[PDB]
């Protein structure tokens, strides 16, 4: 925290990797043997060999991923498009990227207009489209990092919010695992730079043995490996013209982060009925279970959401450090005390202060979160929990204690000030008391920065739990953004669920003999996904039926909506699926001389199949 402030006085051309000349087989090299973090100060590497005869494999893999060699073999670059601090340029000419527009699906459009849709004055209309981008958009979108000031967070309340957050993250278990127990899905996706020039991640995951991966993991626990990171322009349907961007991390970072985090990361998405719901299926009657878990015991419930603006680009460094530190707190026995610090330094140098390669030339990334590693979806959740807790604390403190009626909350506030600005070490008794209070009056349900809160009303009305303005003030003074109160819903009733969570409106319906909650998406999104598609992916119906089955599955609850057209969407999808099937059979009958004899596929075009997915038995 102190270093964050003290590092704003020093020139920006003195941070980053530290290089030194070493000799192999009589040949000079430049390698990174340390770093100079803005927060953690000088970190010196340990296992660097001043001399070496020949190098086998892992030394290649850690010498090629460094930015030192490429940077030293580059051309000095002065870029006047952005205020970001440039480093160098690898090739001779910068590369310009563009994003193609969408491809129409005229046949489905004609079938939709046949059934009397898209009339002037109707309620459901097209709003989501494949937006196409111009040329120099990648750099103009990377420029948005200019919204991340160096923020010095308050210390004496952070050192208590950390305790509360850690109390929240209690049930789960974590620890290091041997390199032969890791689990990876979709082993044929891209792997960073410059390893992408010779094959995807499967080739590196097969070329490397178990002892080699063990050595590479036990190596970074006592060293530092700065890396590079690529930037791409995504290709997906949206509702605002601003482009999206993803960042693929290098292979040597993921291949160690997996082994360091997998146990906890898999023990979180395997437990039902908690404050973090990553991994709870919204099918098979899971939405009702979640929404019943939320309404635990709150006395006079309301509902309260919020949404940070520029969540992944205004993240102050200190909060990300706290997130990583809390997520690496279960390592009580597996690793020593310096090992954890070196692992944290490696994480901070690989996914928080990397050398972004937006376009065709390197740059420095002042901060924020790179949404490509294996720990974003959980670090963001813990950051959200921290924000909520600190907002609540700030709300509870700043209230005239003369007018507090109860004799319990007043004493709690007294002891809160005592434990905040007077004590020096944690008091577990008071922390447990305050956490029980918080779960009694501020029950939360948290996904990766999208939240829903069922908070007491008669307390929040007199400022004992943060209503919304404490959230606004906390964001304003600790995130350098302004959460305008036009994107924050508030429901005064409970018989209808939260207004919007994960882009799914919630409806209370009567199925079977009782009432359950069903999520239904926005009809415009479904129609847009049906009408616009990348080429040959559908471009037509006959080849790829399995798109429409899943699309109809995701849009079944639309039948129960009291509005009319919202069920007509589902009926239109059903009829189109039937038409597609009975024309595919005709096509490969007429050109043939025979066709289908046994199908059993007649359950696709009738609701008996889709309805099964929203019943609680599986």
């Amino acid at each position: 925290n102190f270093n964050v402030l003290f590092s704003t006085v020093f020139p920006p051309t003195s941070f980053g990797p530290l290089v030194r000349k070493i000799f192999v087989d009589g040949v000079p090299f430049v390698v990174s043997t340390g770093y100079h973090f803005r927060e953690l100060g000088v970190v010196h590497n340990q296992d660097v060999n001043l001399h070496s005869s020949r190098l086998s494999f892992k030394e290649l893999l850690v010498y090629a991923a460094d930015p030192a060699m490429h940077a030293a073999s580059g051309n000095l670059l002065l870029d006047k498009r952005t205020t970001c601090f440039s480093v160098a340029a690898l090739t001779n000419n910068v590369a310009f990227q563009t994003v193609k527009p969408g491809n129409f699906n005229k046949d489905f459009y004609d079938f939709a207009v046949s059934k009397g849709f898209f009339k002037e004055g109707s309620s459901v209309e097209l709003k989501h489209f494949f937006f196409a981008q111009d040329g120099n958009a990648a750099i103009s979108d990377y420029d948005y990092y200019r919204y991340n000031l160096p923020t010095m967070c308050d210390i004496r309340q952070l050192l208590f919010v950390v305790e509360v957050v850690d109390k929240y993250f209690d049930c789960y278990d974590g620890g290091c695992i041997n390199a032969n127990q890791v689990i990876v899905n979709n082993l044929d996706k891209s792997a960073g730079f410059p390893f992408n020039k010779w094959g995807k991640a499967r080739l590196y995951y097969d070329s490397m043995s178990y002892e080699d991966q063990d050595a590479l993991f036990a190596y970074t626990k006592r060293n530092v490996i700065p890396t590079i990171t690529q930037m791409n322009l995504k290709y997906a349907i949206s509702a605002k013209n601003r482009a999206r961007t993803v960042a693929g991390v290098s292979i040597c970072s993921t291949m160690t982060n997996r082994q360091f985090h997998q146990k906890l990361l898999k023990s979180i998405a395997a437990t039902r009925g908690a404050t973090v719901v990553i991994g709870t299926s919204k099918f098979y009657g899971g939405w009702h279970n979640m929404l019943k878990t939320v309404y635990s015991d709150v006395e006079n419930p309301h509902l309260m959401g919020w949404d940070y603006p520029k969540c992944d680009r205004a993240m102050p460094n200190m909060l990300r450090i706290m997130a990583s530190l809390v997520l690496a707190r279960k390592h009580t026995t597996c690793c020593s005390l310096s090992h954890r610090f070196y692992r944290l330094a490696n994480e901070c140098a690989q996914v928080l202060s990397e050398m972004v390669m937006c376009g065709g030339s390197l740059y420095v990334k002042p901060g924020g979160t790179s949404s490509g590693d294996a720990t974003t979806a959980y670090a963001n959740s813990v950051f959200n929990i921290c924000q909520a807790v600190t907002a609540n604390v700030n709300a509870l403190l700043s209230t005239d204690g003369n007018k507090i009626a109860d004799k319990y909350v007043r004493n709690l506030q007294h002891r809160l000030y005592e434990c905040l600005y007077r004590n020096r070490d944690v008091d577990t008794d008071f922390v447990n008391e305050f956490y029980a209070y918080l779960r009694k009056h501020f029950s939360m349900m948290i996904l990766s920065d999208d939240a829903v809160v069922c908070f007491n009303s008669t307390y929040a009305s007199q400022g004992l739990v943060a209503s919304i303005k404490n959230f606004k003030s906390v964001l304003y003074y600790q995130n350098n953004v302004f959460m305008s109160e036009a994107k924050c819903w508030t429901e005064t009733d409970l018989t209808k669920g939260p207004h919007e969570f994960c882009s799914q409106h919630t409806m209370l319906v009567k199925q079977g003999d009782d009432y359950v909650y069903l999520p239904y998406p926005d009809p415009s999104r479904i129609l847009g996904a049906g009408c616009f598609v990348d080429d040959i992916v559908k471009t037509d119906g006959t080849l790829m039926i399995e798109r429409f089955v899943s699309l109809a599955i995701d849009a079944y609850p639309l039948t129960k909506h009291p509005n009319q057209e919202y069920a007509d969407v589902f009926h239109l999808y059903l009829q189109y699926i039937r038409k597609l099937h009975d024309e595919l059979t005709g096509h490969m009958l007429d050109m043939y001389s025979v066709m289908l004899t046994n199908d059993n596929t007649s359950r696709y075009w009738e609701p008996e199949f889709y309805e099964a997915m929203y019943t609680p038995h599986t």
Binding site: P12, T13, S14, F15, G16, P17, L18, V19, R20, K21, V27, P28, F29, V30, S32, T33, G34, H36, F57, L60, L61, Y63, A64, P67, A68, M69, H70, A71, A72, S73, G74, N75, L76, L77, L78, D79, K80, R81, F85, V87, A88, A89, N92, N93, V94, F96, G135, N136, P194, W198, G199, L203, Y204, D206, S207, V364
Partner: protein
């Protein structure tokens, strides 16, 4: 399953069985043909049912080791490619200035963000618009980063050469305008 040791025994057993069936001998002979053939099946109990699994296991092992050999060869190819890339791109270092400046450090440790700032022989400048071009790349030679650079080529987005005589106030809106100026270090 066509040359097993019990196949000949089964063949002679069934030959005797059919010969005696054509003979129509005693009921004891009928039991003999119903039992010797029953044990002709009892030999094939394992003959035509165990090598059928043995061949499957052998094929599985053979394909698994085929895959292993392919992976092992790809490993060598990748190692060769990465080694040759390193030993080819290394020589761009221009070992004079770098070795001269490292010796000036306390124990040969300098921040990376300054090596291309002093020991790079080719500057590349990207300019968004004419008014910004006016300040930095003025004239045919300019100065930046405590040195003296000089212009040798000016291109635009479409990657075509444009001479400096055409960059005026009124001629600006007739160009693609991410101009890319490349310069060299003077002495």
């Amino acid at each position: 399953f066509s040359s097993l040791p019990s196949y000949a025994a089964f063949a002679t057993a069934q030959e005797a069985y059919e010969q005696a069936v054509a003979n129509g001998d005693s009921e004891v002979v009928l039991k003999k043909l119903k039992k010797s053939l029953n044990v002709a099946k009892s030999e094939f109990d394992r003959d035509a049912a165990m090598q059928r699994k043995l061949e499957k296991m052998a094929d599985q092992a053979m394909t698994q080791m085929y895959k292993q050999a392919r992976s092992e060869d790809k490993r060598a190819k990748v190692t060769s490619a990465m080694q040759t890339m390193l030993f080819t791109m290394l020589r761009k270092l221009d070992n004079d200035a770098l070795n001269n400046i490292i010796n000036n450090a306390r124990d040969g440790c300098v921040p990376l963000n300054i090596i291309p700032l002093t020991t790079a022989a080719k500057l590349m400048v990207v300019i968004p618009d004419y008014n910004t071009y006016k300040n930095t790349c003025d004239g045919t030679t300019f100065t930046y980063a405590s040195a003296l650079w000089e212009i040798q080529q000016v291109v635009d987005a479409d990657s075509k050469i444009v001479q400096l005589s055409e960059i005026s106030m009124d001629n600006s809106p007739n160009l693609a305008w991410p101009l890319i100026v490349t310069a060299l270090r003077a002495n």
